[PDB]
Enzyme design. Structure first.
Site, PDB file in Angstrom:
ATOM      1  N   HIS A 172      11.674  -8.509   5.185  1.00 31.34           N
ATOM      2  CA  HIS A 172      11.098  -7.129   5.158  1.00 31.34           C
ATOM      3  C   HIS A 172      10.438  -6.820   6.505  1.00 31.34           C
ATOM      4  O   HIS A 172      10.783  -5.785   7.105  1.00 31.34           O
ATOM      5  CB  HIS A 172      10.073  -7.002   4.011  1.00 31.34           C
ATOM      6  CG  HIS A 172       9.369  -5.686   3.873  1.00 31.34           C
ATOM      7  ND1 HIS A 172       9.750  -4.747   2.935  1.00 31.34           N
ATOM      8  CD2 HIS A 172       8.275  -5.170   4.485  1.00 31.34           C
ATOM      9  CE1 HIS A 172       8.949  -3.701   2.998  1.00 31.34           C
ATOM     10  NE2 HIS A 172       8.027  -3.929   3.942  1.00 31.34           N
ATOM     11  N   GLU A 173       9.509  -7.677   6.946  1.00 31.80           N
ATOM     12  CA  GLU A 173       8.847  -7.453   8.245  1.00 31.80           C
ATOM     13  C   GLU A 173       9.843  -7.369   9.412  1.00 31.80           C
ATOM     14  O   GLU A 173       9.745  -6.485  10.259  1.00 31.80           O
ATOM     15  CB  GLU A 173       7.831  -8.563   8.533  1.00 31.80           C
ATOM     16  CG  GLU A 173       6.653  -8.632   7.558  1.00 31.80           C
ATOM     17  CD  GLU A 173       6.042  -7.251   7.288  1.00 31.80           C
ATOM     18  OE1 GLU A 173       5.848  -6.917   6.100  1.00 31.80           O
ATOM     19  OE2 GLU A 173       5.808  -6.502   8.260  1.00 31.80           O
ATOM     20  N   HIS A 194       9.853   2.625   4.996  1.00 27.88           N
ATOM     21  CA  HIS A 194      10.007   2.419   3.556  1.00 27.88           C
ATOM     22  C   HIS A 194      10.890   3.447   2.878  1.00 27.88           C
ATOM     23  O   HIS A 194      10.922   4.618   3.250  1.00 27.88           O
ATOM     24  CB  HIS A 194       8.679   2.418   2.832  1.00 27.88           C
ATOM     25  CG  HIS A 194       7.751   1.368   3.329  1.00 27.88           C
ATOM     26  ND1 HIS A 194       6.714   1.579   4.184  1.00 27.88           N
ATOM     27  CD2 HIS A 194       7.830   0.023   3.111  1.00 27.88           C
ATOM     28  CE1 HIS A 194       6.133   0.406   4.432  1.00 27.88           C
ATOM     29  NE2 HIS A 194       6.810  -0.596   3.839  1.00 27.88           N
ATOM     30  N   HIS A 197      11.331  -4.001   9.461  1.00 27.05           N
ATOM     31  CA  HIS A 197      10.450  -3.043  10.126  1.00 27.05           C
ATOM     32  C   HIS A 197      10.613  -3.117  11.654  1.00 27.05           C
ATOM     33  O   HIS A 197      10.869  -2.096  12.290  1.00 27.05           O
ATOM     34  CB  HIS A 197       8.986  -3.183   9.689  1.00 27.05           C
ATOM     35  CG  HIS A 197       8.690  -2.645   8.313  1.00 27.05           C
ATOM     36  ND1 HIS A 197       9.018  -1.400   7.853  1.00 27.05           N
ATOM     37  CD2 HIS A 197       8.007  -3.259   7.297  1.00 27.05           C
ATOM     38  CE1 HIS A 197       8.553  -1.262   6.605  1.00 27.05           C
ATOM     39  NE2 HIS A 197       7.914  -2.373   6.204  1.00 27.05           N
ATOM     40  N   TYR A 252       8.718   0.104  -2.672  1.00 26.15           N
ATOM     41  CA  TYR A 252       7.462  -0.422  -3.276  1.00 26.15           C
ATOM     42  C   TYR A 252       7.649  -0.890  -4.723  1.00 26.15           C
ATOM     43  O   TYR A 252       8.399  -0.230  -5.469  1.00 26.15           O
ATOM     44  CB  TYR A 252       6.407   0.686  -3.332  1.00 26.15           C
ATOM     45  CG  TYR A 252       5.524   0.830  -2.119  1.00 26.15           C
ATOM     46  CD1 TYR A 252       5.668   0.006  -1.016  1.00 26.15           C
ATOM     47  CD2 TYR A 252       4.533   1.797  -2.080  1.00 26.15           C
ATOM     48  CE1 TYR A 252       4.855   0.143   0.097  1.00 26.15           C
ATOM     49  CE2 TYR A 252       3.711   1.947  -0.977  1.00 26.15           C
ATOM     50  CZ  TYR A 252       3.872   1.116   0.116  1.00 26.15           C
ATOM     51  OH  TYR A 252       3.063   1.261   1.204  1.00 26.15           O
TER      52      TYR A 252
END
Ligand SMILES: [Ca+2]
Ligand SMILES: [Ca+2]
Ligand SMILES: [Ca+2]
Ligand SMILES: [Ca+2]
Ligand SMILES: [Ca+2]
Ligand SMILES: [Ca+2]
Lengths: 542, 475, 544, 481
Positions: C110-111, C120, C114, C164
């Site tokens: 995930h990071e 998101h 980014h 989320y």
């Protein structure tokens, strides 16, 4: 017109000796768009066929083309002897030749793949592994056309548009010069339909393509997220995502247990004029015109109604403005149908389906959807579905015929397709031929009809429009066609009772497709043969 | 509809000649304009409608004020006023509530373009005290007979024309973009015949259908969109057919590509009729009329054409022609009524017009929403759609027309909310198999004297145009 | 270890107030390979987890990573507070924080997404069409994390690793802050398995990717060209291509869910002469690493004397692929079900993999050899593989806190180990628990104790044949002296004896909520009602 | 095998000292010597030259590399005779390897001339020399003239049973790259390996030896005793008198990529059996970075053991290990008890490509030992190519001497060819004879009737422990074509 010849037969007849038949020899990858020039010597049918080939490239890859502007490198298309090209760019103007038989979609696509940088599939080093070459059956001196030499890390493909046919450079028509080591493929090698799935994979890996130029949206309903479609809130009810567990889907036709999904709106219950709305996600068009293609079925009341709507931008950036586009009405067919709707959206918009209950007291069925596609191209002018083709093919003798219902172009010319399932001149083939019909416009129209292109296309019903290998044939109406065939049907047309109309004499390709080929490549999906026909003025290319 | 002098008096203002703010002087088109946020959405839509009238009848043009030395900004701060003349610096125009009628708007803009009042006999003894200076000396621009008046029983000015609020007069246009073609007439099998008064709607063009073979025929932009208006008549077989075609450029500079646009089919109403056809031509083109014989023996007449016009504007969403209107006005008591057919807008809302020929001394039009086959996909209550009702001036030249018009915007403030889905709030009528809402409109839409005055009742036909469009994009 | 926390909870616990919970807001696309630094403050388990995440990127996209060496733009991984990243290519420096608790595969993935440039999924401009935000259930002052902030003609993705979880920034654990409008997706949003198919499509469109760094070959046999494979000419017969329509035959690709489709290769052993053979051979493959793993599914209903031999033919140094080398032999046995095999290849030059079938005693055989679902990857093969038969029946017949144990596996150094599976987790209702243990074996006297700085990677195989579309669950930890009840000392000292291995097992350590039952039943993890677990145990001391 | 003087005489040549070409200041090579193998040179000769270069790298600082265009290069060609030019000419120079010159010791001779050397010939039975040749005698060594060189009558020597040997370099020929480690022992675990001094009867060294006792303590107790190419061969001698459950495990510890050697890889396991004699083991290592080899002894059953594990004579070379090894016990008894045409057969051995092969030994060939190669049918036969061609057979009798400088192992080489008929190398199930001992067909034996003399075996250390140890290799050399 006659049977379509292979490029190797054409170039041999033309007295050429280029490397590998169509390759001419006088850092090498293009930068899109490729600049092009259609030269003045190039005949009107060839100009039309070249522009049709460019639309296939834009629908299936990131390849694009533009008119010339003083650029560094470019392709000039000219009508010289033989079909041939120069492989890869070469940094000052290169030439593609199309003449005296080369004017077919798959032959032009082939010559353009050479200019993009591809060599022959059988020219690869590992030919001795997949195919036999019968060297004793090749014509004298022409053995050099079967020599070899470039690591895109992809398998060998028998379906490749870049493969030679079984009878290339062949000294006696009875014995092929090439045969596959897997015997099933002997009738596949050297196809002239379209790009194979492996041809498109190799083009895309070589040019870093991840998207096409003319495909906006595509949905088979097979994933539970419904392709990012959304349900209305202002309407009375919702579309059910059904799973084929007394009905079958058009994506798989119930051949798979569990797999196979479609959207349903049950019309057997509730109040009259209750509705359900299914909407696309926000789409961003890159042309002024789009074709919405979908498959639908109706079994309820005849009074039930499937309406297609667009919601487009308000010019302030809010997608609020509704417009009503087409209506489809319930009838006695009860089988899956194909629909085409022309959209004209110049700004961001959504497409919507509205099912509505007409007479729920007298309905035991509903409205069904499957296999949606939206392309930035014109919609096919006439569409003809022949039901139960396999039974039509078994119940007909040689030279028995079927005729489409009358169709009409934008100018108002009337026309139709004649289908002979068992071709008289070509045993084991299907023959399609084009005829003009008299109609209510014949006085405002011009005669003889000239410079109109006819495109006939047998639809490969593959749900993904990129992987479709649809058979197509093209011709341009000309005063050189005589028996003039295209004069006003009233004067020379053979009268018919079924339209109370005069039909012209029909001039069509004797072999459109083999029966063996029709069986494969999803052409006869649901045992429906689907034919598209277009009839359009191309005088502006002159 | 109140007068401008009444509105500014009620606002408690004391402006030069009632509506001029006194803080070379001629504009350079297009005029740069800004619509203020304070100005109402209904007013903004009406101002755009007034701008279209200016472009159609005059060289005057309006553009957004991206950047200029001088410009016009429209405000709703206090009453209706306009400083006269370009001020060489950005100026100001005020559109008071109750003065959103298109006429009032055209008036204020004529002051900004440089006009003073037309009057500038006056009865000074009938004027309100302290307003006599508004009658000092030194048409859409004239005072009404009861301007600044102290007693409604006697006029201040002397008659029935003065202070009209229809449109620009031919003299106002003489003292002061969107018309392509106009004609009054004053490869195919046969020709249309030019014929003389079988009386002209204005000469007219006749294609005969009483002889020969079946399916014999005869043949006769700056913006993206156009409206073709024409008058036609048919008396032959109901099988006979008028077809409208566009021939357009193929982009080689050759107008050759035909496209079929509309077909009109013979029917039992043998009177003259009005037709509207939407053209969407973005390149050079021609419009063609194909007449065609459907059944010659049965036919005992022809197809006829007169009074053509082509404008670069959207066609009216519905058109209603009330026949023998003089006899209708005689045959109806007060509160007797007529209802239009059920029209539809582009979004698919169903609507109509209710007419009460004796309202006292006025005709009364009112708008209503009808239930339709789209009621489930539509949004309710309908809001921010503008309604325009217009009575056509049948004058064939579009420049000369003084068509009466009224406007309003659908709003949740309209209660008796009148605009919710008609099946829930409305009443069922068998004659449409539909629900009709309550009807909202103007009791004073036009005077009975006015309909007689300007050929509105040519052929004894009354022609009403109606439009219903989303104006949310101005918000 | 306990339940894996969400990134929103980890940063909220750290008292941070970043943009959208995990973005730091101090031409913006990278040029591959991306330069990286693993900082000295970063713990040994986090270093091992980051290198494991880079192998996933090289298998499923054209993304690749390389050493710093003094380039102008680089990603520095550090152990600050919270899990967070900057977005896109800064071109000067970019810090990514793998804080305490951030060291799980899908969090690091995930990071890194980014840093590659993604925001998101629940912050898109069209979001309010696809999910509901319960504004009254968000914690006070955090509502800015649900605001709306890139158009690639891609649809809204509920499976997105960039979405989320239902309880993000939530004021009450019983009520979700997000719910999907299509109600099936309420248990899908915020998954922490892997990249979705639509995540990879967007990554590939944004970076012009058309191939991946570590996939050499794939074949399901579903196209009649056998994916570019060829038959032998020097052997005694040929491998057939069969359609799964006959009674008693079933393809592993579709398991007869489809009819008239589903294909596999067969070699019959029910007739002919003894020691007749058949060859099936790949296209010429060009490796880009020293090591490869050949993964395939096989079945053997014939004589236990029948044999499937994996061979390689490699370049002879003239550029001609002619030298044969024998790699692995598989033997017939009484388990007639489909099985998974892994064979390590060590080819540095162009080569071809070959399957030899061989008939042993066709006098007494009514069956044959079957093959389906081949893949070849430039990665180390899994150390141990455990297949749990009839898993749906196991899950129903076991009670809470009943257990199964794997066979004993061995790592390259010779440490003995296994996996304990509890189908109905005691501490996590509706979850399955997996836990690792070390077993005594014939090498215990050469090995170092307590075993430290070795990394354990446990994976549940998604069983999808195309490796680009697998969403395999993976969990990781590094053995440490802190683990006490030291758990990792020599099992003959600190373990308990077991009669099934005649061996000593350590105390088992792992995750009680390893995976939900609902997740296993949704995707291909329980294909054929076989559950397939992979386990690895390798020395990572060299990252210290 | 003929002598070089007979080969050049049969060619009708008259070179200086029989095999030196003279073409007309100080000249001497600078290593590595650049070389070329010409296209005219047959495939067996190319393979034989590469085996001879591995002997130079195993025994000396001499090395050979491919042509780079420097002033001096040596080109090997197939002219008539075996001959060379002595020392560096400062230009390209030629070596001739004719028909019959493919035997390793002839190639090693011509190269010794190329490095620079002359025969040990010095001030002979002149009445026995061929007419005119007498000048070739003007003024264990490989270069020493054979007794019957330049001889007119085979009944009498010109020049005793040692001279003109064709085994290998003598120690003196080496006195005038690929060895890593060498030990004869003469200079976390539970216990230690005992260095032991052969002082107990029945416990004697192979050369001191290293011992791990299995007759006391607990089960699974252990003891531990701890490159310029990609591959290495660890050769050692071992013995296992203890329980058949006892294990010897060879492990490697290699660099973890920090520069620290900690990672352990298990390599090979050797298991106790009822052959209590010394055995020879070969273990292939594949180490590309710095490493340590480890021997783990482990007690399997100390309640049924009265013995131990023993190690001696370790060596580690940067070369491939021998494909097959055969240890004929009690050779001196075999040679006495057998008649002419009695035979022994080797256990089946398999190359990397999977071809099954073996060796046939006839101890009494007159006064020679005969070794012959054959191909055996095996579990791979259907997948292999036939007839087998272009694979090089090497058969070697190991001189057991622990220091690899001092070994003089007899070696013979041939390359499988379709020209060998009686084609002998076709699939053994088609062309062979069936045997019940292996349950396999065996191809016709092809080899040398004079492989070694019974005299030569006694002189060298080949018959140490009364074991005859034969190594065999069978490898593809098609790439040299
Ligand atoms: Ca479907
Ligand atoms: Ca007229
Ligand atoms: Ca399969
Ligand atoms: Ca075969
Ligand atoms: Ca010790
Ligand atoms: Ca010793």
């Amino acid at each position: 017109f006659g049977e379509q010849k292979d490029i190797s037969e054409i170039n041999l007849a033309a007295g050429l000796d280029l490397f590998q038949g169509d390759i001419l020899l006088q850092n090498t990858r293009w930068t899109f768009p490729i600049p092009y020039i259609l030269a003045d010597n190039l005949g009107l049918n060839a100009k039309g066929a070249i522009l049709y080939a460019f639309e296939m490239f834009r629908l299936k890859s990131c390849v694009d083309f533009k008119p010339y502007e003083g650029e560094s490198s470019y392709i000039i298309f000219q009508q010289f002897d033989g079909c041939w090209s120069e492989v890869g760019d070469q940094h000052v103007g290169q030439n593609i030749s199309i003449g005296q038989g080369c004017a077919y979609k798959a032959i032009i696509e082939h010559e353009i793949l050479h200019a993009l940088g591809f060599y022959h599939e059988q020219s690869r080093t590992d030919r001795d592994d997949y195919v036999n070459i019968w060297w004793d059956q090749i014509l004298s001196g022409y053995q050099h056309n079967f020599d070899t030499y470039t690591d895109l890390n992809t398998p060998y493909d028998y379906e490749s548009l870049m493969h030679y046919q079984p009878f290339s450079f062949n000294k006696n028509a009875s014995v092929p010069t090439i045969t596959a080591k897997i015997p099933e493929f002997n009738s596949i090698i050297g196809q002239r339909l379209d790009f194979s799935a492996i041809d498109l994979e190799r083009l895309n890996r070589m040019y870093n393509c991840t998207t096409t130029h003319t495909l906006l949206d595509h949905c088979t309903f097979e994933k539970a997220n419904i392709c990012g479609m959304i349900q209305g809130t202002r309407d009375d009810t919702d579309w059910a995502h059904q799973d084929s567990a007394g009905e079958v889907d058009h994506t798989l036709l119930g051949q798979c247990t569990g797999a196979g999904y479609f959207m349903q709106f049950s019309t057997s219950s509730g109040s009259a004029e209750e509705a359900a709305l299914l909407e696309s996600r926000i789409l961003y068009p890159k042309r002024k015109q789009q074709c919405l293609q979908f498959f639908y079925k109706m079994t309820g009341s005849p009074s039930d109604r499937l309406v297609v709507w667009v919601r487009r931008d308000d010019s302030t950036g809010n997608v609020r403005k509704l417009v009503k586009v087409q209506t489809f009405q319930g009838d006695d067919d009860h089988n899956w149908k194909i629909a085409h709707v022309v959209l004209k959206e110049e700004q961001k918009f959504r497409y919507l389906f509205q099912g509505t209950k007409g007479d729920p007291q007298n309905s035991t069925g509903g409205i069904y959807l499957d296999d949606i596609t939206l392309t930035e191209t014109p919609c096919p002018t006439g569409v003809w579905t022949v039901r139960n083709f396999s039974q039509v093919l078994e119940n007909t003798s040689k030279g028995d015929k079927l005729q489409s219902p009358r169709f009409y172009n934008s100018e108002g010319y009337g026309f139709g397709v004649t289908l002979y399932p068992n071709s008289r001149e070509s045993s084991g083939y299907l023959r399609l031929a084009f005829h003009v019909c008299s109609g209510e416009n014949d006085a405002i129209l011009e005669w003889p009809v000239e410079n109109r292109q006819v495109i006939i296309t047998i639809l490969d019903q593959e749900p993904d429009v990129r992987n479709r290998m649809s058979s197509s044939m093209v011709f341009t109406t000309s005063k050189s066609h005589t028996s003039v065939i295209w004069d006003r049907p009233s004067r020379v047309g053979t009268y018919h009772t079924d339209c109370n109309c005069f039909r012209s004499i029909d001039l069509g390709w004797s072999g459109f497709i083999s029966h063996q080929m029709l069986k494969r490549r999803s052409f006869l999906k649901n045992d429906d043969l689907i034919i598209f026909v277009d009839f359009e003025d191309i005088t502006h290319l002159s």
